[PDB]
Design a protein around this ligand. Sequence first.
Ligand code: UBP
Ligand code: UBP
Ligand code: ZN
Ligand code: ZN
Ligand code: ZN
Ligand code: ZN
Lengths: 257, 257
Amino acid sequence: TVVVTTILESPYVMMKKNHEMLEGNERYEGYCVDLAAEIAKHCGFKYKLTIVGDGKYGARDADTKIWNGMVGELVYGKADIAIAPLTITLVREEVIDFSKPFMSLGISIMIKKGTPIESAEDLSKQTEIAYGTLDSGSTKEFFRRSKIAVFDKMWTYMRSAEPSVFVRTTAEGVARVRKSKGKYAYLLESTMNEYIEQRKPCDTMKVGGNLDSKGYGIATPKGSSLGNAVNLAVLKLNEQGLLDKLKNKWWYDKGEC
Amino acid sequence: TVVVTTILESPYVMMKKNHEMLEGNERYEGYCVDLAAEIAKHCGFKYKLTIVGDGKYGARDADTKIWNGMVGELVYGKADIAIAPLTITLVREEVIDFSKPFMSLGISIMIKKGTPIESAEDLSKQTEIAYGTLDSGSTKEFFRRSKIAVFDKMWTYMRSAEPSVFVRTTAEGVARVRKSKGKYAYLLESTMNEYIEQRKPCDTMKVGGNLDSKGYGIATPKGSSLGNAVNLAVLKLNEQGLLDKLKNKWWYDKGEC
Ligand SMILES: N[C@@H](Cn1ccc(=O)n(CCC(=O)O)c1=O)C(=O)O
Ligand SMILES: N[C@@H](Cn1ccc(=O)n(CCC(=O)O)c1=O)C(=O)O
Ligand SMILES: [Zn+2]
Ligand SMILES: [Zn+2]
Ligand SMILES: [Zn+2]
Ligand SMILES: [Zn+2]
């Protein structure tokens, strides 16, 4: 039985409303729960879904050099595979193996409906509408290291804006956009932006094209015997149109706006 | 070094805005962070604050018979003491020890300012203004088992109300009160009600007296070498007026309304 590690993040993995009457894998539902079933079917294995112990995705402590979250569970042998919205990054690819991406994404802009902003360039040219990102992570790092004029201008602003424009969590960034009467725009992953856009109170909107490109991949321990099969399954699913179908179902078919 | 388990719940434990520049226990602030320092001071031990991995307080699954949250961390040896807003209950006291209560609370009513409701009696006499609680937990169970008229009347209503008046999380309940335009009242722990009342946009109000009584307590494993000292520490802090100073500090001095 393959131990799958995942994380509670809507609409990827959520508790069914009646989860208390259920048990095992049936307690969960969502995009990744559906994806796990597909992968298992094509790779030919039985599995058990478990929620990552520390509820984190995967980062290496600069001091101890220890990995936490799902990457950690894979690295230290606590799980056999990770199916969740885990970004494929150089540092993680150095310690675990990733499948080809099952979803493509990029940094995007979230605004409260009605805000007169249509792109990052628009944000960089004005001042009365503040904007920020998570206080740590790839999105913040993207701006900090950019050599592109527009993003350099945005980073210069964000790094010294007052009050601070950074937030610690997604919920924090979304709430700020929603209570700032259009005076705050949040920079986040397009997938989350797109999801929130389809959820009540339906007062946010994703604008402009993505600022960068990346994707989520299924992860397995280095030199795992599941790596090859899982990679082929992800390609087969995309070719069959199933990845797009799954995305449309959990983002739009179940939308509230 | 004593391992302390706690949970990110405002204003009990929160991440300082400059946490990325701080280390260890200094990354956190809040009522329980202050309480932990006092308890360790008077008990004479060194400690390290850790956040419970699954973000839960403590319940036993009737299936697996496994304890989750902070109670689980104590019973399975992951932490030596739990310092958080953990309600003292019979089922929990059966596996861990609780200090005398450091804070008293009870079920209360939260309304959007403007709602013509001043008590549980007012709610029980009508239906235009819907009211509910978490879909699971002590508050819901309180109503389900009550033999008291008014509470029986309230439960008789809640159990058959449509759409469902129950919510999955505190955030959901609070958000529902704020966006229901005076048509939903939320029943919750007085401590959280009093806290929300002091947070922007200052659009909610706590009405009526508590419907019941209970307390939060510090938890330690059975046979812990710290059990006795922790208990005496709580009593001394109460007698010194320290517990009330901390409540006033985190609820009102730092209040925004
Ligand atoms: N892919 C990330 C984890 N992850 C997943 C989904 C998601 O929506 N967001 C962030 C959304 C936001 O920007 O608020 C995120 O950070 C990782 O690999 O660590
Ligand atoms: N004391 C509970 C945990 N706990 C702590 C703080 C709190 O505000 N609320 C609930 C607030 C609300 O009713 O929405 C709560 O359920 C336990 O011991 O499990
Ligand atoms: Zn298939
Ligand atoms: Zn941070
Ligand atoms: Zn003292
Ligand atoms: Zn539930």
